[PDB]
Amino acid sequence: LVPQARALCGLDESKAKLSSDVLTLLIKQYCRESGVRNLQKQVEKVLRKSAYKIV
Amino acid sequence: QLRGSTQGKILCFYGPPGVGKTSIARSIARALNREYFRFSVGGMTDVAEIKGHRR
Amino acid sequence: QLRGSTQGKILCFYGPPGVGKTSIARSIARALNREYFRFSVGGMTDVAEIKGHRR
Amino acid sequence: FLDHYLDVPVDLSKVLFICTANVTDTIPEPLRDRMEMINVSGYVAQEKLAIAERY
Numbered sequence: 001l002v003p004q005a006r007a008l009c010g011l012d013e014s015k016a017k018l019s020s021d022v023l024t025l026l027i028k029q030y031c032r033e034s035g036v037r038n039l040q041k042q043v044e045k046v047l048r049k050s051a052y053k054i055v
Numbered sequence: 056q057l058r059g060s061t062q063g064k065i066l067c068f069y070g071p072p073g074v075g076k077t078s079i080a081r082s083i084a085r086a087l088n089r090e091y092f093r094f095s096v097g098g099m100t101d102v103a104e105i106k107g108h109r110r
Numbered sequence: 111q112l113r114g115s116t117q118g119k120i121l122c123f124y125g126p127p128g129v130g131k132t133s134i135a136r137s138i139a140r141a142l143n144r145e146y147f148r149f150s151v152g153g154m155t156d157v158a159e160i161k162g163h164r165r
Numbered sequence: 166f167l168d169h170y171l172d173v174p175v176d177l178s179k180v181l182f183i184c185t186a187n188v189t190d191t192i193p194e195p196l197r198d199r200m201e202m203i204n205v206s207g208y209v210a211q212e213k214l215a216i217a218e219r220y
């Protein structure tokens with residue numbers, strides 16, 4: 001998911017690093033469901049806000 | 056603008072009626088410059104309307 | 111591979127939406143290398159699609 | 166996408182869809198999953214005035 005969405009957004013590792021512990025937090029808190037869609041949106045939002053913040 | 060070529064996405068809104076949910080669309084389309092079009096679907100039931108016939 | 115000749119079957123996965131049902135098939139077709147196809151039948155109500163017409 | 170009339174698939178990924186329902190319950194879940202929700206919220210009087218006094 002992470003490499004895919006990052007390629008989709010054109011961001012880069014070392015420009016938008018996410019510690020795995022952060023991811024553990026994101027899943028522990030914000031998405032707790034059988035699918036892997038809802039989480040997909042969370043981690044895309046996580047990119048896009050940073051992307052606007054940088055660009 | 057960051058990743059060059061244009062892209063498209065799908066998303067939705069919800070709140071009390073009359074809050075401006077529909078007014079914003081036309082301004083947005085004139086902002087991004089995509090062509091506007093709307094067509095209310097509510098109460099429709101014919102799938103063929105959105106998929107045509109066998110020709 | 112054991113019996114020699116190739117031969118087909120019918121299958122049906124099922125589970126919660128977004129678990130990957132639609133995205134896995136394409137990889138399967140690429141794996142066995144038989145050519146891919148796809149055929150949504152959501153809500154269709156016309157037998158001709160499966161049966162053509164009398165000429 | 167595959168219109169019955171013109172069977173050849175029609176890519177339309179670049180389009181920017183939008184959808185507008187005022188209550189996020191009636192939508193069947195599998196479909197409801199596809200589209201991120203965003204809650205527009207009701208206005209407070211102090212600035213409802215100042216918009217109406219401007220527009």
Ligand SMILES: Nc1ncnc2c1ncn2[C@@H]1O[C@H](COP(=O)(O)OP(=O)(O)OP(=O)(O)O)[C@@H](O)[C@H]1O
Nearest residue numbers: 070071072073074075076077078079185187216220
């Ligand atoms: N933030 C806003 N700025 C400007 N106009 C607004 C705003 N909110 C509501 N309006 C006014 O509300 C009127 C209709 O808005 P709109 O149709 O978008 O409401 P709505 O939620 O779409 O209602 P419905 O979906 O039931 O039509 C417009 O004339 C618009 O000027």
Ligand SMILES: Nc1ncnc2c1ncn2[C@@H]1O[C@H](COP(=O)(O)OP(=O)(O)OP(=O)(O)O)[C@@H](O)[C@H]1O
Nearest residue numbers: 036037040125126127128129130131132133134195
């Ligand atoms: N086993 C898996 N490995 C990698 N990715 C997966 C897997 N399962 C699901 N996904 C992710 O799910 C996404 C699409 O899943 P898919 O569309 O098959 O869900 P689905 O069950 O078909 O949902 P629905 O049937 O409601 O459309 C892809 O982005 C894919 O990466």
Ligand SMILES: [Mg+2]
Nearest residue numbers: 073076077078
């Ligand atoms: Mg409206």
Ligand SMILES: [Mg+2]
Nearest residue numbers: 128131132133
């Ligand atoms: Mg699917």
